[PDB]
Write a protein that holds these residues in place. Structure first.
Motif, mmCIF file in Angstrom:
data_model
loop_
_atom_site.group_PDB
_atom_site.id
_atom_site.type_symbol
_atom_site.label_atom_id
_atom_site.label_comp_id
_atom_site.label_asym_id
_atom_site.label_seq_id
_atom_site.Cartn_x
_atom_site.Cartn_y
_atom_site.Cartn_z
ATOM 1 N N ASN A 852 0.808 -1.211 0.000
ATOM 2 C CA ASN A 852 0.000 0.000 0.000
ATOM 3 C C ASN A 852 0.845 1.266 0.000
ATOM 4 O O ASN A 852 0.290 2.366 0.085
ATOM 5 N N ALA A 853 2.170 1.137 -0.090
ATOM 6 C CA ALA A 853 3.039 2.305 -0.074
ATOM 7 C C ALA A 853 2.881 3.172 -1.315
ATOM 8 O O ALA A 853 3.314 4.328 -1.306
ATOM 9 N N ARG A 927 -7.600 7.592 -2.686
ATOM 10 C CA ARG A 927 -7.341 8.718 -1.800
ATOM 11 C C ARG A 927 -6.753 8.218 -0.486
ATOM 12 O O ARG A 927 -7.342 7.357 0.176
ATOM 13 N N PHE A 928 -5.594 8.757 -0.112
ATOM 14 C CA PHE A 928 -4.910 8.357 1.113
ATOM 15 C C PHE A 928 -5.332 9.290 2.243
ATOM 16 O O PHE A 928 -4.981 10.474 2.248
ATOM 17 N N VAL A 937 0.136 4.094 7.148
ATOM 18 C CA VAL A 937 -0.991 3.310 7.633
ATOM 19 C C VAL A 937 -2.252 4.156 7.494
ATOM 20 O O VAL A 937 -2.192 5.355 7.228
ATOM 21 N N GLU A 938 -3.408 3.526 7.670
ATOM 22 C CA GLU A 938 -4.673 4.237 7.592
ATOM 23 C C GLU A 938 -5.081 4.764 8.968
ATOM 24 O O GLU A 938 -4.468 4.456 9.991
ATOM 25 N N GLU A 939 -6.139 5.581 8.978
ATOM 26 C CA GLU A 939 -6.613 6.172 10.226
ATOM 27 C C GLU A 939 -7.065 5.101 11.211
ATOM 28 O O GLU A 939 -6.789 5.196 12.414
ATOM 29 N N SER A 944 -0.421 0.284 14.262
ATOM 30 C CA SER A 944 0.698 -0.109 13.417
ATOM 31 C C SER A 944 1.272 1.094 12.683
ATOM 32 O O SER A 944 1.574 1.032 11.488
ATOM 33 N N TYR A 945 1.434 2.210 13.388
ATOM 34 C CA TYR A 945 2.000 3.424 12.818
ATOM 35 C C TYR A 945 3.350 3.706 13.462
ATOM 36 O O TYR A 945 3.451 3.785 14.690
#
Length: 1042
Positions: A852-853, A927-928, A937-939, A944-945
């Protein structure tokens, strides 16, 4: 010399009205000018000096009688010289400029110039002659004042009543040539009392033991391995220990000679305290710590320590330790007094805990400092008594200070101004006849101090003194009852009913203004002094502090004001209030007196029956006139001068800019411009319908964004309190007194920002769309970034981007002792506010060398065909060079088959072919909306951030992606409260969207565009001005000539 027609046609044409609004009429503009301090004083000069003309007229002295004739002759000669030089300079058109750049600023007439310069000459001479002599005397009965009163006679509290500031040979029932002194001693004792009232001028007898370079060696005190090469200063304060062998009278030797018999320097008969000069390193003696420049001319640690003693007398002093005179540490060095006990108030700098497990001191300092450390302590004669001596260490060593007469004229009830005036008159009498002790020298001239403080308000203060003189009808000993000044005292009587209602309010508000200005310096200079000891902790140089100690004075968390240090000025605003926390009291009594000045000025202009005189030839001003006054000509010219000051002043320009906001009905539906309150309250007054559909809380965040932008520009950010920031922001807002100052720059800038914020919000964001389109781009990712700096890196999964960073960069002091991070839409070209680490990670290192990078890398295009439509759009070589470098050196996308040597067609053809053959659909166009750091990472997955790492610091960053596919999509449904319409505002919530719009509104280009929209989008057009002084003052962008 007939003037040429070019300048006659080109000069400004005066009109009947100053401007064309409902607030620019004569009855309103003259009232506002008479409320303007500088304009009001320019008027009061012309309404006060006619009073002093009578004194010159009926005066016995031949010299004073001839002063008026000499002034008139000098005025005639000066007019001759002015005419000569203007002629020799201008030739053809000298008369036009004679009326333009001379008469207009003077009153608009030839005789206006002579009634200005003469009326100023006589007031200047009367001002000089008030203080030309010394009248402090001890008056004996039947023989007059004694040529030299004895020491034991005057140094008594019960004998203070005979030090009354009275002349020598003044007889009421006689026409004496030098009887005019009975005038001055009456006015001086008035002016002096003003000096005693407003300035609160306490005398302090002080001894300063300067910082001593230790012959023992700094390594004994402060080791070099931690503090390299110390220099004698407050942070490293050392005095050579007391030795009985050396015959010294300074340093610790002076402190031993002093503290042993400290109780013997207070002359209990006079209640004064006199400490010998030899015991101090400098000349020593006494200093006058008045309210105005005591934090300016002297060290803040000195002035604040004096204040602490001031309230120590009044049982109002807090935060300082107390020890008797006999308890002073005179055998050891002086600093040993400050190592106070730590076991269990008093604010003590526990440097043992401050420095933790680091050795900063050595030898005696290490053994002593366990034991806390202070800066100021209270030394008193007796345990039951109150602290009369205050010992505090500042920049130039340790000062022992004592206010003399503090037990006399300062008690728990407050300051006794009559007793204070009596005591300072006693000291001035001491200095007058050289009746001071031989071991002390009086560097104390009360008359010079009252003259220097009074010369600031050379007009308002004299007028108020005269009014208070004539307001005391029960005192028959004044110069008013002298038959020699019967008409002069009548002239003062002819100005009470006319102006006193206005002048009392003007004085009572100007003195409050000066008192608030001076008390602001308390929290300004204490913060300035405390600044280096925060710089050291910021630069990890906390060990450099050493002997730095926090002052005992408490500060307000909710206000950022020193309440006790403000009591010294509350004891002033509680005295000027009777004439005719300190923060709350002054903020209430400034508005309660500003409304009084409004009323008094309106009544004065009403009672003057002001009418506009037609302007003379070649004139460019709209003059005014009156006839309902004691001296109609001088009053008319005074109003002329007040107008000439107000029209050119920035207050009128800001009033014009205020009117431009008044006109806009769209803006006034959401604000109350005069009230400076957001309109509609909270209800259905216009809710809910289009054309800026939002609440009034939805504008509080725009205002808070403006307040934060103003806070970031503050020179010192701790003069407004602390915790969170929502309170400091409203404290800063209050500090501007915008509602009390509607004609200031601080309000036109605030309203310019507010209409910038609305002009992006109206027409379904017709201008926010344009700003976003001209800001964003298709070949560069754009983000809404909440970036917080974590000095420490990582259920224990609390989000750190939504936890408020109280005291960031140590901006609200020091921590050890006594959804956030939003940057708005930030792009590659405008990533200044972001740290270089996160800015590089976003706009230059989106996909690091460490899936996902790739999501959102080409979301700046949004759709598959978008970048295809842009690659073949290249026309020149550099246009493709930039795109290729961005696609490789910025967007890190692998490129196959590209060649630099290819021609224009193949250059784009290879890129288009590889883009198609590599993306023949990794969520690259998605959209990131999530966290970016070391990883991405996602919200939802905050567990895992990994925080971004840079130079030992860490960053936590949330980014919401923004492309032009949503810049165009913001429209009518963009401000709806509904969640389902969030896609109509950049996939944002309403609060986030409005915060972004506010951050956009801070742009100077946005503000300029919105202000030009305000001026152009005027229902009545641009404001016209009929007076040149209003045309030259404010730019043509706002006003036009008739």
């Amino acid at each position: 010399a007939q003037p040429t027609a070019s300048t006659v046609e080109g000069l400004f044409k005066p009109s009947s009205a100053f401007a064309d609004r409902t607030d620019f009429s004569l009855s309103s503009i003259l009232q506002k000018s008479l409320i303007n301090r500088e304009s009001f004083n320019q008027y009061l000069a012309m309404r006060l000096a006619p009073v002093l003309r009578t004194f010159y007229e009926d005066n016995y002295d031949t010299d004073i009688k001839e002063r008026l004739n000499g002034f008139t002759a000098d005025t005639d000669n000066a007019f001759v010289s002015q005419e000569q030089n203007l002629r020799n300079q201008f030739r053809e058109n000298y008369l036009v400029h004679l009326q333009t750049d001379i008469f207009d600023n003077t009153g608009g007439n030839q005789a206006a110039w002579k009634l200005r310069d003469v009326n100023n000459k006589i007031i200047d001479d009367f001002i000089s002659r008030i203080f030309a002599k010394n009248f402090v005397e001890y008056v004996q009965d039947g023989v007059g004042p004694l040529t030299k009163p004895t020491k034991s006679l005057i140094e008594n509290t019960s004998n203070f009543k005979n030090i009354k500031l009275q002349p020598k040979f003044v007889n009421k029932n006689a026409k004496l040539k030098i009887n005019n002194d009975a005038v001055y001693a009456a006015i001086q004792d008035k002016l002096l009392d003003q000096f005693i009232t407003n300035e609160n001028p306490n005398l302090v007898s002080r001894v300063v033991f300067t910082n001593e370079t230790p012959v023992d060696g700094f390594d004994n005190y402060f080791n070099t391995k931690v503090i390299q090469s110390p220099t004698p200063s407050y942070q490293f304060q050392v005095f050579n220990k007391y030795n009985q062998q050396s015959g010294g009278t300074k340093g610790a030797n002076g402190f031993n000679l002093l503290a042993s018999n400290l109780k013997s320097y207070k002359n209990d008969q006079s209640k004064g305290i006199d400490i010998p000069n030899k015991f101090s390193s400098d000349s020593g003696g006494k200093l006058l710590l008045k309210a105005s420049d005591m934090f300016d001319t002297f060290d803040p640690s000195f002035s604040a320590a004096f204040i602490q003693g001031y309230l120590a007398l009044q049982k109002k002093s807090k935060g300082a330790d107390s020890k008797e005179v006999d308890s002073l540490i005179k055998d050891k060095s002086i600093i040993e007094n400050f190592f106070v006990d730590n076991n269990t108030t008093v604010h003590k700098t526990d440097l043992v805990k401050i420095f933790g497990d680091k050795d900063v001191f050595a030898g005696e300092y290490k053994q002593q400092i366990s034991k806390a450390v202070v800066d100021l302590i209270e030394v008193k004669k007796d345990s039951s008594s109150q602290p009369d001596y205050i010992l505090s260490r500042g920049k130039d060593g340790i000062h022992l200070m004592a206010v003399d007469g503090g037990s006399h004229y300062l008690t728990e009830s407050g300051r006794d101004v009559a007793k204070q005036k009596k005591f300072l008159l006693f000291r001035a009498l001491q200095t007058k006849y050289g009746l001071v002790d031989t071991d002390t020298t009086y560097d104390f001239k009360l008359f010079d101090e009252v003259k220097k403080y009074f010369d600031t308000n050379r007009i308002l203060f004299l007028f108020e003194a005269l009014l208070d003189l004539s307001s005391d009808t029960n005192n028959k000993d004044n110069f008013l009852s002298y038959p020699q000044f019967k008409k002069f005292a009548d002239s003062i009587k002819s100005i009470e009913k006319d102006l006193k209602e206005l002048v009392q309010a003007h004085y009572k508000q100007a003195v409050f203004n000066e008192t608030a200005v001076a008390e602001n310096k308390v929290t300004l200079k204490l913060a300035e002094r405390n600044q280096p000891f925060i710089d050291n902790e910021r630069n990890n140089q906390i060990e450099q502090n050493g002997l730095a100690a926090k002052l005992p004075y408490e500060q307000d968390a909710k206000t950022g004001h020193y309440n006790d240090l403000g009591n010294y000025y509350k004891d002033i605003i509680d005295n000027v209030d009777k004439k005719g926390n300190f923060s709350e009291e002054v903020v209430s009594k400034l508005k309660d007196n500003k409304k009084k000045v409004e009323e008094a000025a309106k009544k004065h202009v009403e009672a003057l029956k002001v009418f506009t005189i037609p302007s003379p030839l070649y004139s460019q001003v709209i003059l005014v006139q009156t006839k309902l006054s004691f001296t109609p000509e001088s009053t008319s010219l005074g109003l002329n001068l007040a107008l000439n000051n107000y029209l050119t002043s920035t207050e009128l320009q800001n009033s014009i800019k205020l009117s431009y906001f008044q006109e806009d009905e769209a803006f006034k539906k959401i604000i109350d411009i005069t009230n400076l309150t957001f309109s509609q309250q909270s209800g259905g007054t216009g809710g809910t319908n289009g054309n800026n559909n939002l609440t009034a809380d939805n504008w509080k965040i725009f205002k808070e964004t403006y307040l934060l932008d103003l806070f970031e520009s503050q020179a010192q950010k701790s003069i407004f309190g602390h915790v969170g920031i929502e309170g400091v922001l409203d404290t800063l807002y209050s500090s501007l007194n915008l509602e009390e100052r509607l004609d200031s720059d601080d309000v036109i800038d605030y309203l310019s920002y507010l209409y910038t914020a609305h002009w992006l919000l109206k027409d379904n964001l017709k201008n926010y769309k344009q700003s976003l389109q001209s800001k964003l781009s298709r070949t560069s990712n754009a983000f809404l970034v909440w970036s917080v700096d974590s000095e420490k890196n990582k259920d224990n999964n609390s989000d750190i981007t939504q936890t408020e960073v109280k005291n960031p960069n140590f901006v609200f002091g020091s921590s050890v002792y006594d959804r956030y991070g939003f940057r708005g839409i930030v792009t590659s070209s405008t990533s200044g506010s972001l740290p270089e680490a996160v800015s590089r990670r976003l706009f230059k290192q989106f996909v690091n060398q460490t899936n996902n990078a790739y999501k959102g890398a080409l979301f700046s295009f949004g759709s598959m065909d978008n970048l295809k439509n842009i690659i073949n759009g290249i026309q020149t070589q550099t246009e493709f060079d930039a795109l290729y470098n961005h696609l490789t050196s910025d967007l890190n996308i692998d490129v196959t088959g590209v060649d630099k040597n290819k021609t224009l067609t193949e250059q784009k053809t290879s890129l288009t072919s590889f883009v198609d053959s590599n993306f023949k659909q990794k969520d690259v166009f998605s959209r990131f909306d999530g966290y970016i750091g070391d990883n991405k990472v996602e919200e939802k997955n905050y567990t895992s951030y990994q925080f971004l790492s840079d130079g030992g610091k860490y960053h936590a960053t949330f980014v919401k992606q923004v492309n032009l596919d949503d810049v165009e999509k913001i429209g009518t449904d963009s401000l709806k409260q509904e969640d389902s319409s969030k896609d109509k505002r950049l996939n944002l919530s309403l609060e986030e969207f409005l915060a972004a719009i506010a951050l956009e509104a801070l742009d100077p280009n946005n503000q300029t565009q919105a202000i030009n929209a305000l001026i152009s989008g005027n229902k009545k057009g641009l404001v016209k001005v009929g007076d040149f002084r209003i045309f030259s003052s404010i730019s043509a962008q706002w006003v036009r000539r008739f």
